[model samples]
Target: GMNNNMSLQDAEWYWGDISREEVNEKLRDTADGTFLVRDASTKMHGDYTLTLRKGGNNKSIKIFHRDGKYGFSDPLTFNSVVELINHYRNESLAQYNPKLDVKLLYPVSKY
Candidate 1:
């Protein structure tokens, strides 16, 4: 199934698959579909790089310092990996983690 059950490698494979649609044709998989990525802009004191290709249907993410790996945050849906790059390019890293994006997902929780 198109699930996260795939390893970081498989994740990298799909990551590459998704990425190749635009910039890269080989987005290394750590083993699963959900890999790690760095934010487009430079790092802030609290800023860590983007946690690469990770996540699929029905699951939370791993690795903290990676997005610090947010439980509240799932893997970036490379459903549109290149689109992610586009958004970051135009809108920028700041566009990240906003309640606005959250609403796009299902069951957006209110804290």
Candidate 2:
């Protein structure tokens, strides 16, 4: 049942060590019209976009639906979404965590 290109024991790539409980707490506190940025592909090379929306009332998290894709916001922060994305990208490229590496890459200007 294994595919020639896929491995059964492939390691999952995670952006950080945030727990589900913490994620829930963040969703609870986030407001509407927040921003969210994410990788378009796990391979780390692709186009990405920024989403702006209000939190949903039915769920603690608000997701943006576009072209059959779902975009999620960072816990309670707005602009920090891009920051987090860049942090993850740098960390992944450098092969080290931002917190430990002591060098974080932040956007020079806001769009």
Candidate 3:
């Protein structure tokens, strides 16, 4: 998804298939608030830094911190920034633990 400052051309910069299950899991983990961004590989060729901030209220927080490592704020504190991830995880578990049906599967194929 593209943020307000990002254009369609910028959106073309990324190409990865993040599974719905993974997204849902991330959503559960970031319900309170979170900061995400395309990997460096995708941004290396683009101009203007890009990062994604979501949750807490459907907002996107962008930052140009050196090297593009996305940072998330501590959820315990509510002073803007990004909400703590733990808060979102806890809330998600409380609301949809059973429905999540999370499982741990060992690798069946070797590379």
Candidate 4:
């Protein structure tokens, strides 16, 4: 069988360790709601940053892990980062960011 890890290793939007400045530039020319995930530069282990653009403004949120679940809020959590992304694609993120009631529309490609 193919390695089990293979299925868990290919999310192109999960740009590892890219800086916040780089992400802003990457999402600048894209349409609204274009986003990317990257390792938090100064955060603890398992923390990631979700950066997105809307109206030419970039908002960076932290997606954190706790008790083996991933989430931006305490009560609502997902089993995986992909699941979290999938959920937000259909749901608004107003609960997470009160001012920005938006969802993920496009993912910034690795290439």
lDDT of 1: 0.28
Candidate 1 lDDT over residue span 19-69, tens digit each: 222222323332223333333333332222233332223122222222322
Total residue pair clashes for candidate 2: 3
Q: What is candidate 2's local distance difference test score?
A: 0.29
lDDT of 3 at 28: 37
For candidate 4, which ten residues in a row score worst on lDDT? 1-10
Model 4: CA > 4 A from native: 1-11, 73-77, 81-88, 96-100
Ranking by TM-score: 4, 3, 2, 1
lDDT (tens digit, per residue) of candidate 3 on 2-111: 44443222122122223334433444343332323233333444323222223334342232323232322222322222232223324332233332212111111110
Per-candidate TM-score against the hidden true structure = 0.20, 0.22, 0.22, 0.60
Clashes of each: 27, 3, 2, 0
lDDT of 2 by residue, 1-111 (tens): 423342211111112223344434433434433333333333122213322222243222223333322323222333233344444634332243221221223221112
Which residue pairs collide in model 3, if any?
74-84, 75-84
Candidate lDDT scores, in order, read: 0.28, 0.29, 0.29, 0.54
Off by over 4 Å in 3: 1-21, 28-30, 35-42, 45-55, 65-111
Off by over 4 Å in 1: 1-24, 28-34, 57-111
Residue 20 in candidate 2 has what lDDT? Answer: 43
Clashes of 4: 0
